[PDB]
Amino acid sequence: LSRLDPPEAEVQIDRLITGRLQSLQTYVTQQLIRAAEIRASANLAATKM
Amino acid sequence: LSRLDPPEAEVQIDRLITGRLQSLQTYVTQQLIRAAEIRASANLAATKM
Amino acid sequence: QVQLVESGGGLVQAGGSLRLSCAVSGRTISTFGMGWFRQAPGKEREFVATITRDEDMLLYADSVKGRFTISRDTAKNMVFLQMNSLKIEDTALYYCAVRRDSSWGYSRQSTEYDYWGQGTQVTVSS
Amino acid sequence: CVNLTTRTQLPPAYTNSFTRGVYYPDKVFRSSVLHSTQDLFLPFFSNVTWFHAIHVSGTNGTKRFDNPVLPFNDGVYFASTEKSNIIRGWIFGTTLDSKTQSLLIVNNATNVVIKVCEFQFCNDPFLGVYYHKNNKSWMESEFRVYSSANNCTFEYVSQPFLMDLEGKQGNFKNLREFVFKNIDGYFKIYSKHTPINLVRDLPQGFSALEPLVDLPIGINITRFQTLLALHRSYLTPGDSSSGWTAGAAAYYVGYLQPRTFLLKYNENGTITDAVDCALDPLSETKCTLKSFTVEKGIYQTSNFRVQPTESIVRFPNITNLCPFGEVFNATRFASVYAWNRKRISNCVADYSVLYNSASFSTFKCYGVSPTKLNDLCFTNVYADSFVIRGDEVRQIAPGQTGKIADYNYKLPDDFTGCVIAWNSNNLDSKVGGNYNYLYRLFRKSNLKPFERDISTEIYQAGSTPCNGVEGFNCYFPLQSYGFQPTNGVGYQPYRVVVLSFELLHAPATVCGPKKSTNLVKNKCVNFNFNGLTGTGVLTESNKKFLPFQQFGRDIADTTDAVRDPQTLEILDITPCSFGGVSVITPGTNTSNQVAVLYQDVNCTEVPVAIHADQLTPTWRVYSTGSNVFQTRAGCLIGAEHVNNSYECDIPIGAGICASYQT
Amino acid sequence: NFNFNGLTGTGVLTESNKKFLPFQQFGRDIADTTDAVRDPQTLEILDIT
Amino acid sequence: VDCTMYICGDSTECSNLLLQYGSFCTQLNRALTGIAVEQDKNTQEVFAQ
Amino acid sequence: LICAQKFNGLTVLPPLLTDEMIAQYTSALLAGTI
Ligand SMILES: *[C@@H]1O[C@H](CO)[C@@H](O)[C@H](O)[C@H]1NC(C)=O
Ligand SMILES: *[C@@H]1O[C@H](CO)[C@@H](O)[C@H](O)[C@H]1NC(C)=O
Ligand SMILES: *[C@@H]1O[C@H](CO)[C@@H](O)[C@H](O)[C@H]1NC(C)=O
Ligand SMILES: *[C@@H]1O[C@H](CO)[C@@H](O)[C@H](O)[C@H]1NC(C)=O
Ligand SMILES: *[C@@H]1O[C@H](CO)[C@@H](O)[C@H](O)[C@H]1NC(C)=O
C-alpha cells in the first residue's frame, strides 16, 4: 500500500489474498482429514473401552 | 519461454504454474481420501484376520 | 549521426590481432548482430565476417573453425570480433556510429550500406 | 617504487579450513532456534592457501614473503596468527592504480585507518618499520603502499584491535579472522579474535565471526592484495623482498561461494554450531530435518537429475541425389526470368550437403539465422530456383524490396527469409550449371508480388547500349543477361534457390536447409525430430512403423518412439534418469556413517547424475566405490550387501532393508 | 503502532528479559515473526505482543 | 510425484518463479510420502500377524 | 497403464513387502491355522 497506489496495488493485494486463501483452504482440508482419522481412532478407543 | 521476452511471459508462466499446482493439490486430496478409505478397508481386513 | 562508443577501430594493422568493437543500441542484451562492411569507391574492399542475431553461428566460416564473439558487457553493451590476417592496404572511411541496418542475417551479398557517409578521411592507398 | 617484485617466489601451500569462517548472516536475534540461510559462506573442510612469511636463523632454511594480487570474486576470507602483529591491513580494487577508486585498509599503533582514494598501489606494498634510534621500539619510517592518490572520497577511523608489538612466547595465540564481501554495494566486514594454543595449522574449535562495520562505498571490487610490515634489510637478516625483510608470520586466505547453512543459535543469541548442507549426505539430511541430530531411518533429502549432455537435431535425408533437388541443379530450370516453381513435403534439395560440417555462407539468410529454420519455419513459401553469377542475387535477395530491385522479380516488402546459393566439388552432388540465359533489367509497368515479369515491355531509351555480359552502364531493358553498373557483379556462376514469401493459407511449407546432427544412442541428449522436441535417451526400437508414420505415442499421449527421418529407423524415447535421493543412516549418536539410495536409476549412471561437482572427499565417496549395490528400489551405495537376511531395520523397498552392524 | 528503523508493525510493548548482542537490532521467533526489538535511542530490549 | 518437475520440469525460470508460492510442493511431497508409508503400514498390519 | 507412468516426475515406489513374502505370510498363517 505504501509503495503502490490503490489502482495499481489492487493486483498485488488480490494476488496475496488468493494465495493466502489457497493456503488456508489446503490447511483446512488437511485438518478435516486428520479430524476424520482421529474420529475413527476415537471410535476404536471407545469400542475398546 | 522462447516466443516471448521474459517480462511478458511471466504472466503466462505464473498462470500455468497456478493451474498445475491446483491440479496437483486436487489430485493429492483425492489420493488422501482414497487412502483413508483403503486404511479403513485394511483395518477391517485385519479385524477379519 | 551521433558516434557510438568503441574500444578500438579503424584501419587494420599487420600481424597480431585487433578486437574491433562498436557499441550496440541495446543494453545488457546480446541478441543482436553486427556488420563491419566499409563502403568506398574502387575495388579496394574486402569481405568482412558477419554475426547473426542468434549468435550460435559465427562468421562466414561457421562455428566449426571460428571462435565465440563476446556481445555482452556491464558498463556499456558492446560486440567484440577477432580479425583474421588481411592486407594492410585500405582506402575506405571508418565511422563507428549507429548502424543503418538492423535485420542482421547470414547473407553474403548483403552489405552495411550502398552509399558512403560522414567519417574520417584516413587513407593509406592514394 | 619497484618495477617488479623480487623474492624467492616459492610455490604456495594449502591447509584445511575445518569449521572456521562462520559469521552471523544478519543482525537478527534468535534464541535456541535452528535457522537455515543461504548466503556467501566458507565451505566446511575446504582448502585455504597457506601463505608463508617466515625467516629461519641458521646456515640454511626456508625464508620467503608473499603478498601477490589475488582475485576478489563473490567474497574473501582471511586469517592470521603471529606472535607480533605483522599484517597491518588489506588492499581492495580492480586496477590497483590511480585509474579507479580502491578501498585501503591499514592498521597502526594508534587507530585503524580506512580510506578510499585512487591510490597508485606499488607492486610490493608494505609498511616501513625500523627500530628507534634511542627508544629501542619499533618506529614507522615509510608507508610504502602507494605513491599518489590525486583524489579523496572517504575516510574513517576505528579503535585498534588486539595489539601485539614485540614478539614474545613461542605460540601464535594472537589469532585474527576476517571476512570481506561486496554484495549490494556494501563492503561488509566480519571478524573476531580468539586465543589459540597451537604452533601451526588452525584450531579445531568453533567460533562465529561477529560483524564489526559496514561501509557503503559502492565501488566495484575485483582484485585484492595483503600488506605487511618490512624491516630494514641492512639491520636484520631474512629474505630480501625487493630489498626488505620482516619477522616470522603466517596468514591464510579463502574464498566463498553461494550455498546454504544450518545455523544453531544459543539461548543468548550467539552462534555455537553450524552444519554445511553441502558438506556430506549427513549434513544434507540434517539440513532437511532442520536438526543437528538425525534418528535412525531413511529420509528423502533431494532429487537427482541427469541433465542432457548435448543437443541433437535431425531431419529428412540430406538429401543426396533426391529427384526434387535435381530440378534446381541441372534439370528443368532457367534464369530468374523463367525460374522453376515447386512445393512438396518429399525431401530437401542437395543444398543441405554443406549444412553438416562445411556450412559456408552459401545459405544466405537475411534477418534470421539458418539455425532458427530447424526450430521453426516461415509461412507459405514457393521453391524458386535459377542460375545467376554468384552474389548477383542481391537484387532478388531479401532486404532489397520495396520498389528498389523488384522490377525483374517482385517479392513482398516484408520478405525476411533465407536464400540458398551453393556450389562445391566435394561437399555437393552436382556442379553449378551454366548461367547463359536472358535477363530483364528494368520495366515501366508494375509487377505482381512474389512473381516474375512475363510482359514483353521494350523501352526506347539510351544511345550507346553496353556490349556483352560485362561492360559499362547499360540502358536497354532486354539483353542477354544483365548486371547493375552501380553494384558489384560478375561473380562465379552459382545456382540460387529463393524462398518466395507468400504469407497466405498453408503455413510451415517447404523450408530451407535443415541440420542433420550425428545420432546418439543410449546417452541422454536433447532431440528435435521435425519440429517435435524433447529430451531423453535415444535407443534402437523394435517397433515396426508404417511407411507414412513418423513417430509413435503411448496411451498417455506422450512421445515414446520416433522414426529416424534419414535412415527410417525407429528409435525409442526414454525419459532422463530421475528419482529421489534418500540418505540411509542410523542415529547420529550411534555413528555418522551414511548410505545414499538413488531411486530407479542404474548404478553406472550415479556418478554422472549431476555429481562430481561438490566436495569430492565427502560426497564422491558415497557417490561411487566398490560397495555399490543394485536393488529393485534403486541403486544403493555406501552399504555392503549380505545374505544373512536379518530382520528389517530401515525400510528400503522390495523386501530389502539396511541396518548398522559393528 | 511502532516503526523501529523501518520495521513497522503492531503490538503491546513491554519489559523484555532477553539479552541482545551489541550489534543485533531485533529478534524473531521460531515462526519468523518479530518478538523483541532493541530501542535504538536507549538500547533497551522491548518485547512485542 | 515430483512437484517441481511436474509443475516446471527442466526449466529454470519456472522453478525460480514457483519459489514465490511458499512451500506447497514440500507439503504435497510430505503428504505423498505419508501415504506411501501408510500403504506399507497397512500391508504389514494385515499380513504380518 | 501403471508401467507407462514414468515421464514428467511420475514415479512408483515398490512395496516394502514383495508378493512372494506376502504369499509366505499367507502360507505360514494357513499352516498355523491347520
Ligand atoms: C540417405 O542418404 C544417404 C546418402 O545418399 C544414403 O546413403 C542413404 O541410403 C539414405 N537413406 C536411406 C534410408 O536410404
Ligand atoms: C543412541 O541412539 C539410539 C537411538 O537410535 C539409542 O537407542 C541409544 O540408546 C543411544 N545411545 C546413546 C549412548 O545415547
Ligand atoms: C543396469 O545396467 C546394466 C548394464 O548397462 C544392466 O545389465 C542392468 O540390467 C541394468 N539394471 C537396471 C535396473 O536398469
Ligand atoms: C551372497 O550370495 C551370492 C550368490 O548367491 C554370492 O555371490 C555372494 O558372495 C554372497 N555373499 C555373502 C556375504 O554370503
Ligand atoms: C540519548 O540521547 C539523550 C539526549 O539526546 C541523552 O541524554 C542520552 O544519554 C542518550 N542515550 C544513549 C544511550 O546514548
Side-chain angles (χ1 to χ4, degrees):
Chain A
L1 293 164
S2 305
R3 294 196 299 94
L4 285 174
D5 292 331
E8 293 82 3
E10 192 276 331
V11 182
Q12 306 300 264
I13 296 89
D14 174 86
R15 225 165 196 167
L16 282 178
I17 297 169
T18 181
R20 285 167 184 180
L21 183 63
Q22 179 85 337
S23 283
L24 196 56
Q25 183 62 255
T26 307
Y27 167 85
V28 165
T29 306
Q30 198 73 43
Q31 279 294 293
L32 278 162
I33 280 166
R34 270 156 186 154
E37 185 185 298
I38 294 294
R39 192 210 315 111
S41 180
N43 285 288
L44 192 66
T47 310
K48 272 162 176 293
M49 185 64 72
Chain B
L1 285 164
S2 61
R3 276 177 57 187
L4 286 175
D5 188 73
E8 293 82 3
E10 274 305 331
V11 67
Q12 308 295 317
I13 293 163
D14 198 89
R15 291 177 64 86
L16 185 65
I17 288 163
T18 299
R20 293 184 176 173
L21 183 63
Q22 188 274 331
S23 309
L24 205 56
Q25 293 179 356
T26 179
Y27 162 75
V28 166
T29 309
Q30 194 83 243
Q31 282 292 316
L32 281 152
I33 296 164
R34 191 166 297 101
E37 182 65 26
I38 290 294
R39 193 203 322 107
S41 189
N43 283 358
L44 187 52
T47 308
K48 294 264 186 171
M49 279 280 209
Chain C
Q1 294 181 355
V2 297
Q3 299 181 4
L4 271 285
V5 180
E6 56 181 353
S7 300
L11 309 184
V12 296
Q13 304 177 3
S17 174
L18 292 167
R19 268 179 172 278
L20 182 62
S21 67
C22 274
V24 73
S25 307
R27 200 193 301 184
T28 65
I29 303 296
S30 173
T31 56
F32 299 113
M34 187 66 204
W36 313 95
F37 295 93
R38 292 188 291 280
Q39 192 70 7
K43 66 186 185 300
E44 299 187 354
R45 296 195 306 96
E46 299 294 345
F47 175 81
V48 300
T50 300
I51 180 57
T52 66
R53 181 258 179 196
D54 282 336
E55 203 174 342
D56 50 12
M57 283 176 174
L58 306 165
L59 320 183
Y60 72 101
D62 199 67
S63 60
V64 66
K65 195 168 178 63
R67 299 295 304 282
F68 177 78
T69 58
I70 299 165
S71 50
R72 45 184 170 186
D73 189 11
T74 310
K76 179 73 172 187
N77 197 9
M78 188 158 285
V79 298
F80 302 89
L81 176 63
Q82 288 191 356
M83 168 263 289
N84 198 32
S85 301
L86 283 169
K87 297 169 186 178
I88 56 170
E89 188 173 4
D90 197 336
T91 184
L93 292 81
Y94 181 86
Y95 194 60
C96 175
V98 65
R99 296 272 68 91
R100 275 76 66 84
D101 193 1
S102 64
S103 57
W104 304 108
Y106 208 65
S107 311
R108 187 178 61 172
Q109 80 299 353
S110 293
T111 58
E112 179 54 36
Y113 207 76
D114 290 321
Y115 295 171
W116 58 74
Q118 300 178 355
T120 186
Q121 303 87 350
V122 69
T123 177
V124 296
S125 184
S126 57
Chain D
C1 300
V2 177
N3 189 25
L4 187 68
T5 185
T6 307
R7 46 173 165 273
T8 309
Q9 306 171 6
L10 285 175
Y14 286 95
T15 183
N16 206 17
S17 76
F18 303 100
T19 64
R20 295 283 152 181
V22 183
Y23 66 85
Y24 292 75
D26 55 355
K27 310 168 198 171
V28 185
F29 166 85
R30 301 181 188 87
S31 176
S32 182
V33 176
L34 301 172
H35 180 54
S36 171
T37 187
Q38 183 169 19
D39 195 359
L40 280 293
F41 272 104
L42 188 69
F44 271 29
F45 298 95
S46 55
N47 62 332
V48 298
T49 311
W50 191 350
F51 285 73
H52 200 194
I54 203 165
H55 171 40
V56 184
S57 179
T59 58
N60 296 274
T62 305
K63 58 189 181 283
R64 54 189 288 184
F65 298 103
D66 295 325
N67 51 328
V69 171
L70 307 172
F72 178 67
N73 309 343
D74 300 336
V76 174
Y77 170 84
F78 188 88
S80 51
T81 73
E82 295 86 11
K83 306 181 177 183
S84 54
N85 286 352
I86 296 303
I87 294 93
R88 301 296 197 184
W90 306 276
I91 287 157
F92 296 81
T94 69
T95 69
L96 308 173
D97 61 355
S98 64
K99 300 296 293 299
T100 192
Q101 273 291 348
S102 48
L103 183 63
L104 183 63
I105 298 165
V106 295
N107 289 252
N108 71 93
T110 307
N111 290 314
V112 189
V113 186
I114 298 90
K115 206 176 187 182
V116 187
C117 314
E118 294 165 347
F119 292 116
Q120 197 69 2
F121 295 128
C122 302
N123 302 325
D124 196 329
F126 64 90
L127 274 291
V129 301
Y130 78 117
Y131 293 79
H132 206 282
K133 299 182 284 183
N134 183 263
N135 303 338
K136 313 193 296 304
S137 297
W138 295 1
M139 171 50 57
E140 185 270 343
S141 50
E142 304 86 4
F143 53 98
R144 301 281 181 192
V145 173
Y146 58 90
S147 60
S148 181
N150 312 88
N151 200 324
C152 186
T153 61
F154 182 76
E155 166 55 25
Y156 182 76
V157 191
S158 180
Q159 289 187 333
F161 314 139
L162 190 66
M163 295 298 102
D164 272 326
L165 281 165
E166 300 184 355
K168 47 182 191 68
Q169 302 285 7
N171 283 338
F172 293 99
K173 66 205 293 178
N174 187 309
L175 159 61
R176 309 188 291 287
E177 319 199 44
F178 311 86
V179 194
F180 320 115
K181 49 169 66 173
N182 206 28
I183 57 168
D184 291 331
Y186 291 96
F187 193 92
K188 319 188 87 74
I189 303 170
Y190 307 153
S191 171
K192 182 173 178 183
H193 314 302
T194 61
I196 56 177
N197 196 25
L198 53 81
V199 63
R200 291 186 63 82
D201 313 332
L202 291 169
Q204 296 302 269
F206 191 99
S207 180
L209 277 62
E210 298 167 348
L212 276 74
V213 75
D214 191 323
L215 276 297
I217 313 309
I219 58 169
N220 184 8
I221 302 166
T222 67
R223 269 178 147 198
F224 84 98
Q225 180 171 354
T226 310
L227 58 90
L228 72 164
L230 307 184
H231 298 63
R232 305 189 174 187
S233 53
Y234 68 94
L235 293 180
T236 61
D239 198 350
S240 299
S241 189
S242 298
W244 292 271
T245 177
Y251 69 94
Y252 315 82
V253 62
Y255 289 80
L256 324 172
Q257 54 264 27
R259 50 174 48 197
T260 176
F261 276 59
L262 188 72
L263 277 296
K264 177 170 199 178
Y265 276 91
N266 202 1
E267 60 176 8
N268 291 3
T270 59
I271 285 158
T272 47
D273 304 327
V275 175
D276 183 2
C277 309
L279 170 62
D280 58 354
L282 182 58
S283 299
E284 178 181 274
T285 181
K286 284 167 171 171
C287 291
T288 294
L289 274 290
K290 300 294 187 291
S291 172
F292 272 61
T293 52
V294 184
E295 182 65 26
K296 168 176 75 177
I298 180 167
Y299 309 95
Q300 184 178 2
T301 59
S302 60
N303 189 332
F304 76 95
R305 299 192 53 66
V306 178
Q307 305 293 355
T309 64
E310 52 183 344
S311 57
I312 297 301
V313 178
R314 267 191 168 281
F315 278 97
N317 205 304
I318 290 161
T319 314
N320 194 17
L321 311 174
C322 193
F324 152 79
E326 183 181 18
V327 186
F328 305 158
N329 303 338
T331 311
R332 291 288 189 177
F333 81 102
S335 173
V336 187
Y337 205 75
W339 42 246
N340 194 319
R341 164 164 290 185
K342 290 293 192 303
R343 58 168 55 254
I344 190 167
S345 308
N346 186 286
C347 77
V348 298
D350 301 5
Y351 49 65
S352 280
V353 176
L354 288 154
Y355 202 52
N356 298 337
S357 60
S359 306
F360 202 63
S361 190
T362 60
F363 315 138
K364 304 171 177 174
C365 288
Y366 189 82
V368 293
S369 195
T371 52
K372 178 173 285 300
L373 309 177
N374 306 335
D375 306 323
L376 288 173
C377 197
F378 310 142
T379 311
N380 194 307
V381 285
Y382 305 90
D384 298 1
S385 75
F386 52 85
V387 57
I388 47 162
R389 281 193 297 190
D391 296 70
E392 276 199 353
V393 70
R394 190 187 293 91
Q395 300 167 99
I396 298 97
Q400 309 304 334
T401 58
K403 304 177 179 298
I404 182 59
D406 297 74
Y407 290 93
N408 179 263
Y409 173 64
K410 186 175 181 62
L411 278 153
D413 302 340
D414 311 332
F415 177 29
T416 306
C418 288
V419 170
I420 312 95
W422 78 109
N423 187 17
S424 180
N425 69 333
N426 196 331
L427 279 291
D428 207 346
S429 75
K430 311 292 177 176
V431 184
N434 195 264
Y435 74 98
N436 184 11
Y437 279 105
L438 305 177
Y439 195 77
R440 176 175 286 279
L441 278 78
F442 187 73
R443 61 174 302 189
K444 288 290 193 68
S445 294
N446 307 85
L447 179 58
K448 190 179 172 182
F450 53 86
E451 182 65 26
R452 57 178 154 86
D453 169 69
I454 48 157
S455 63
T456 55
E457 190 67 14
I458 184 163
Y459 188 17
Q460 299 178 1
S463 185
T464 55
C466 58
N467 171 37
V469 294
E470 62 90 21
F472 63 90
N473 56 80
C474 306
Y475 282 100
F476 208 86
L478 287 167
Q479 287 297 344
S480 304
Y481 207 74
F483 66 100
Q484 299 293 79
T486 49
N487 190 268
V489 298
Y491 316 100
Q492 196 169 5
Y494 290 163
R495 73 279 192 189
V496 190
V497 175
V498 186
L499 276 59
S500 192
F501 265 48
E502 187 185 357
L503 313 182
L504 296 174
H505 39 86
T509 52
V510 301
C511 301
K514 322 195 181 163
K515 198 180 181 195
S516 180
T517 44
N518 196 339
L519 195 78
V520 170
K521 288 193 293 302
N522 305 83
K523 180 178 179 181
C524 168
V525 286
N526 183 14
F527 62 89
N528 186 357
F529 282 98
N530 289 318
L532 170 63
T533 182
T535 318
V537 180
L538 312 177
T539 309
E540 61 186 0
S541 188
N542 182 79
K543 304 293 187 179
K544 295 184 175 181
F545 283 24
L546 308 183
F548 68 91
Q549 295 175 337
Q550 308 297 347
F551 57 90
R553 285 193 188 169
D554 57 355
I555 192 172
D557 204 1
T558 304
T559 305
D560 57 355
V562 300
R563 179 195 285 282
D564 195 66
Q566 302 206 152
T567 68
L568 319 184
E569 302 301 325
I570 316 311
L571 300 163
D572 274 357
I573 307 301
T574 313
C576 311
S577 294
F578 76 97
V581 183
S582 314
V583 181
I584 303 158
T585 184
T588 307
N589 73 323
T590 298
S591 170
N592 54 15
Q593 296 294 347
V594 301
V596 180
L597 172 73
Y598 304 101
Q599 301 190 4
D600 284 19
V601 66
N602 207 277
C603 283
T604 189
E605 309 181 346
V606 171
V608 71
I610 193 66
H611 294 90
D613 287 2
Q614 57 275 9
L615 186 57
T616 304
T618 59
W619 293 97
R620 189 264 186 190
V621 297
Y622 297 109
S623 181
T624 181
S626 44
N627 54 10
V628 67
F629 181 63
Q630 180 79 42
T631 177
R632 189 138 296 288
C635 179
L636 181 61
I637 301 88
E640 325 303 324
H641 168 59
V642 296
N643 310 335
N644 288 125
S645 309
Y646 300 142
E647 183 157 305
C648 174
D649 184 21
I650 305 171
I652 300 284
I656 301 288
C657 283
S659 185
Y660 182 79
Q661 296 288 6
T662 63
Chain E
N1 172 277
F2 49 82
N3 191 331
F4 286 99
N5 294 264
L7 181 65
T8 187
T10 295
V12 176
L13 280 65
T14 178
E15 195 273 352
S16 191
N17 292 110
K18 298 177 173 60
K19 181 59 64 62
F20 275 38
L21 303 183
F23 70 94
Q24 286 169 345
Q25 302 289 2
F26 59 94
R28 289 181 179 267
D29 68 338
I30 300 102
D32 192 351
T33 310
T34 311
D35 200 1
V37 171
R38 184 207 285 279
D39 169 65
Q41 293 192 233
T42 69
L43 318 185
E44 185 66 13
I45 316 310
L46 308 165
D47 284 0
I48 306 295
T49 309
Chain F
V1 178
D2 187 3
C3 181
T4 305
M5 208 172 144
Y6 171 85
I7 295 170
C8 298
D10 77 9
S11 174
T12 58
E13 294 86 349
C14 178
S15 307
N16 296 337
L17 209 65
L18 179 55
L19 299 172
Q20 310 277 310
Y21 280 57
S23 300
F24 275 130
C25 285
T26 294
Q27 261 186 357
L28 305 150
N29 299 330
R30 183 188 310 127
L32 290 172
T33 295
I35 301 299
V37 178
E38 174 148 43
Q39 297 326 305
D40 291 331
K41 172 61 70 60
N42 315 293
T43 311
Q44 188 274 331
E45 294 293 328
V46 164
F47 285 113
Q49 293 179 356
Chain G
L1 284 76
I2 293 162
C3 306
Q5 310 290 4
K6 196 186 294 306
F7 296 74
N8 57 39
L10 275 295
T11 297
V12 178
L13 305 158
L16 182 62
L17 299 201
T18 60
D19 291 331
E20 293 83 3
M21 287 168 54
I22 293 158
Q24 284 186 232
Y25 273 131
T26 307
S27 168
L29 287 150
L30 297 155
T33 300
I34 67 188

